[PDB]
Amino acid sequence: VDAEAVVQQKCISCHGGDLTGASAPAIDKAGANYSEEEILDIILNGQGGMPGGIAKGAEAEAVAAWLAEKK
Ligand code: HEC
């Protein structure tokens, strides 16, 4: 999976093109604040104002792993 491309396709509408926030909060340093598993849970299931189901399976996992390293 190409995680950066999945993020550009599905996450920037709310998180901003450079992930520094737009309508929703920044996620450009999410790995500094969340573990990979916490990030995966949020992607699959949503959290607070974020809907669940935007990414699934291996795609979600690849995105979680990629963001987990951004600090
Ligand atoms: C890909 C499509 C996405 C990824 C990866 C993430 N999001 Fe979201 N998101 C949205 C809101 C309104 C929030 C705040 C909810 C809260 O944390 O109380 C979030 C939150 C996150 C978080 C956690 C907090 C942080 O800023 O790191 C992460 C790691 C995250 N999101 C990753 C809204 C939306 C949204 C609007 C409809 C979309 C398309 C996405 N989020 C998509 C992604």
UniProtKB/Swiss-Prot annotation:
Binding site residues for heme c: C11, C14, H15
Entry GO MF terms: electron transfer activity; heme binding; iron ion binding
PTM note: Is a lipoprotein in vivo. Binds 1 heme c group covalently per subunit.
Leader sequence segment: none
Recorded superkingdom: Bacteria
GO cellular component: plasma membrane
Main localization category: membrane
Bilayer topology term: Peripheral membrane protein
Keywords recorded for this protein, A-Z: Cell membrane, Electron transport, Heme, Iron, Lipoprotein, Membrane, Metal-binding, Transport
Cellular localization per UniProt: Cell membrane
Family: Belongs to the cytochrome c family.
Main function: Natural electron acceptor for a formate dehydrogenase.
Protein name per its UniProtKB record: Cytochrome c-553
